[PDB]
Write a protein that binds this ligand. Structure first.
Ligand SMILES: Nc1nc(N)c2c(OCC3CCN(Cc4ccccc4F)CC3)cccc2n1
Lengths: 286, 289
C-alpha cells in the first residue's frame, strides 16, 4: 500500500448485489478511499476444482437441491482492490450512496444552465493526460492513433482486471483537448468518432479475438469525467452506465450527427443526477 | 465434504453475470447437474481489520492518485455460495439458460426486406393481450385505463412484481389500438397514444404507488418480446433486464423523435441483439455481407 494503518471512518457505499464496498479510511496519522470488489468467476478453473476435492460445507439439502459454502484455493479468491490517495472531499461525496433523479435537459438548458455550472468547476483529469502524454500506463495501450485532432488511445478501463473476457472493458480517450462530453460534438468530430469506432473494434478483434457484434460501444451522459471518451464492453457484460438513461451508442451518435449537424446542440438529453447535486436544482428551476 | 457425483465435466455455461459475480454451470456427471456459484457480500469488519494488518496485495497498475491491486484475502472473505441441482431436468437447464447474444444494426431497408418477411413467416398468438384489452382476463390486475380505442391503453403490473415494495417497481402499458407491431410502425399518428402512455402512466403510478416521474424509466423494447406495442415503467433504482441501451428506447425521446422527424422509425437504422441461434440473425448477416 502507498500508506500504512488504514483506520475506518465511514462505509461510503455497500452493495450485496454487486459484491462491492467503498470505504473511507484515515491513513498516515490524510484521507484515502479503498474500493473492494469480488471478481468474476473463471469457468475452467472452477470446473477443474469441482471435479477434485473442493473444500465444501453443506448448508442444507432438500433432495435434488443442496446449498454449500465453498472455500476455493488462493488463486480463485482474487478481490479487485482500488485505492484513491490522497482523496479529496469530492471523492468522499462522489462514492457515497445517494438516490438518483431523472432529468430532461434541453439544448438551451445546457448552454444557459449546465455548461456555466460545469465551467464554474475545477476538475482534475491528470490521470487522463498521463495516459495521453505517456506518463502512466504507457505499455497497457492496446491501440493508438497519434493524430492530435482525430487520434486517440484505446486502453483497458480501471474497472477491468483483464483476467477474463466476460467483463471486457476498454476506453478510447481522444488526444484532442477541450471536448467535455456528448454535448460538444458536431460534424467536426465525425472523423475522430469514426476512427474510435472502426479502429477501436479492429484492435479488439486482433488483440482479444472479440468480434464487433460482441461489443457494446457507447459514451456516458452525464460522463463521470469531462474529457470525451467511449466505452468498449462485451455485450454480455451488464456494464457501468450501459442502461438507456446513460449510454449513447457511438454508431448512433455518428449517424445522428450525419442526419442533423446540430443534433447534440438542439435535442433534449435524458440522464440521472444525484439528489444532492446542485445541477439538479438548477435544471428543475429552468 | 463432498459433492453427490463424480467427474463433473462442463457441458455449457448456462448463465454468467460479471456484474453480479454469479455463474450457472451445466455439467455432465458419472447425469445433468447444475452448479450455481455466487461470490458473497463483504463483511466490513473483516475488510477493516485485513486492511490494518499485513494484506496480500499485488499491483495491477497506478496512475496519479489511483492504484488497483489483486487482493487474496484470508478464508473468511472467500466464501462462495454454491447451489447444486442434481439431477437437472430439461426444465432446470432451460430456466437457467440464456443464449449469448450478437449485435445487429438493422437499417430501415433491412427491416422491410429481411426482418418483416421473417416475422410474417411466423404465427405467434397475441390472444392473451386482446383478452386483457377486452376485459375477459386480468381485469382485476389493471391499475389504470384510458378506454379510448385509438389513443388509449391499459396499465398492468409485471407478473414478477408482487407490489410488496417500490424498489423493483415494474408496470406495463398495453395500447387498445391493434396493428402496431413495434417501434418500426410508429408515425406522428401515434403521438397522442404515446403521450397518454407517458403522461397518464406516470400520473397513475404517482397516485397509486406514490412514486414520482423522475423516479421512473419509461421505455419500449426493440426487438419487442411480443408484437403488439407495449411500454415498460420501472423504478430508476431497478436496473431490470432489457433496460440496456442495446434494447431499450425511452418513450420521451421516441415522442420527440417523431415530433421533429416524422419518418424516423421507418428511415433510421435501429440496433438490437439477437440470440446466436436465432434464424433472423443469419438472414440479416447474409443480407449485409
Ligand atoms: N485505464 C484507466 N482507466 C480509468 N478509468 C482510470 C481512472 O478512472 C477513475 C474513476 C473515476 C470515477 N469512475 C466511475 C464512478 C464509480 C463510482 C462512483 C462514481 C463514479 F463516477 C470511473 C473511474 C483513474 C486512473 C487511471 C485510470 N486508468
Amino acid at each position: 500500500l502507498p500508506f500504512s494503518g488504514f483506520r475506518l471512518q465511514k462505509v461510503l457505499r455497500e452493495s450485496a448485489r454487486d459484491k462491492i464496498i467503498f470505504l473511507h479510511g484515515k491513513v498516515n496519522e490524510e484521507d484515502a478511499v479503498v474500493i473492494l470488489e469480488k471478481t468474476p468467476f473463471q469457468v475452467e478453473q472452477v470446473a477443474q476444482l469441482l471435479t477434485g476435492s473442493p473444500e465444501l460445507q453443506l448448508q442444507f439439502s432438500n433432495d435434488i437441491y443442496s446449498t454449500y459454502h465453498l472455500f476455493p484455493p488462493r488463486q480463485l479468491n482474487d478481490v479487485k482492490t482500488t485505492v484513491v490517495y490522497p482523496a479529496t472531499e469530492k471523492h468522499l461525496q462522489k462514492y457515497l450512496r445517494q438516490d438518483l433523479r431523472l432529468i430532461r435537459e434541453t439544448g438551451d438548458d445546457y448552454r444557459n444552465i449546465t455548461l456555466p455550472h460545469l465551467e464554474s468547476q475545477s476538475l482534475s483529469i491528470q490521470w487522463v493526460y498521463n495516459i495521453l502524454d505517456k506518463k502512466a500506463e504507457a505499455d497497457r495501450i492496446v491501440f493508438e492513433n497519434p493524430d492530435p485532432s482525430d487520434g486517440f488511445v484505446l486502453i483497458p478501463d480501471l474497472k477491468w482486471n483483464q483476467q477474463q473476457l466476460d467483463d471486457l472493458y476498454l476506453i478510447a480517450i481522444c488526444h484532442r483537448r477541450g471536448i467535455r462530453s456528448l454535448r460538444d460534438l458536431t460534424p467536426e468530430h465525425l472523423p475522430l468518432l469514426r476512427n474510435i469506432l472502426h479502429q477501436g473494434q479492429e484492435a479488439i478483434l486482433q488483440r482479444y479475438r472479440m468480434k464487433g457484434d460482441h461489443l457494446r460501444v457507447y459514451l456516458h451522459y452525464l460522463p463521470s469525467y469531462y474529457h470525451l471518451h467511449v466505452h468498449f464492453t462485451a455485450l454480455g457484460f451488464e456494464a457501468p452506465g450501459s442502461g438507456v438513461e446513460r449510454a449513447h451508442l457511438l454508431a448512433e451518435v455518428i449517424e445522428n450527427l450525419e442526419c442533423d449537424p446540430r443534433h447534440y446542440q438542439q435535442r433534449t438529453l435524458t440522464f440521472a443526477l444525484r439528489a444532492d447535486d446542485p445541477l439538479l436544482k438548477l435544471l428543475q428551476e429552468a
